[PDB]
Symmetry: C3
Subunit: 109 residues, 3 copies
């Protein structure tokens, strides 16, 4: 159901996700990279589903698609299956001990 | 040739989608989302709730979670009354909006 | 077959999706959402607007609503100029962003 390099996440309506980088990347760069790879930054529920599946490693922070304000965006941290929310300015690349990784999601093919 | 899974209902607003009421009891945000994800769907976003209210699939005077955070600790709810909608927000652990219970509704794509 | 319906354009950015400018004059948030819902779609989200700007579908110096709320009374807008985007927020009844009319854009899934 997913293109080469993507993974079928079986939560909600199953979708396809991919960790796009191992480097800490800012918000706009994350979104643009994912858009160039035929996908989008995952929303809140897709992040929660990937965390519940174990697809996202424990204690990992990623940018989700929601804005916190005109100059900030929300991050989701995944640890031991549970999710927590935060936000940062568009230019931030490191959420405490975790570099903020870009994760792309897209529909089933 | 059914447009939805059994237990789900086609809402003809925007691109028609499939909605289902998960529970009749007030439920917090995290449990709402987890139950929707475990029922093959996800929490309805703002426009899906507006469509379900305009169609009448959501009865008058109904408060339900939507899939947008209000801050790191809160999420938005939508109240539906007399065919019109209004937005509010509440902490994750909250299960009640005034006299109304915050009910979980799930949405997914038309099949 | 055709990826989009008559009037809608396939946007080749992110998950490729069908889009349509719903009006040429400033429209408030609620009327924008209602027009989109009544014409088979919904207000585009943040990444859909960013893609439409990066592909050139959105002309330069264009402000449009998106589907996210900034609070219970306001919604976010995206302005596209050159290849780049910026985020603002305005009350539901606002029609103009500075000297830019707030235009409604509808988005939906392909095929």
């Amino acid at each position: 159901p997913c293109d080469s390099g993507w993974t079928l996440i079986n939560k909600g309506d199953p979708f396809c996700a991919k960790q796009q980088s191992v480097t800490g990347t800012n918000f706009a760069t994350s979104m643009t990279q994912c858009l160039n790879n035929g996908g989008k930054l995952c929303d809140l529920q897709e992040a929660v589903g990937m965390c519940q599946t174990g697809f996202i490693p424990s204690n990992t922070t990623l940018w989700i698609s929601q804005l916190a304000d005109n100059s900030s965006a929300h991050v989701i941290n995944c640890t031991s299956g549970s999710w927590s929310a935060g936000f940062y300015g568009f230019g931030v690349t490191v959420d405490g001990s975790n570099p903020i990784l870009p994760y792309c999601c897209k529909g089933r093919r």
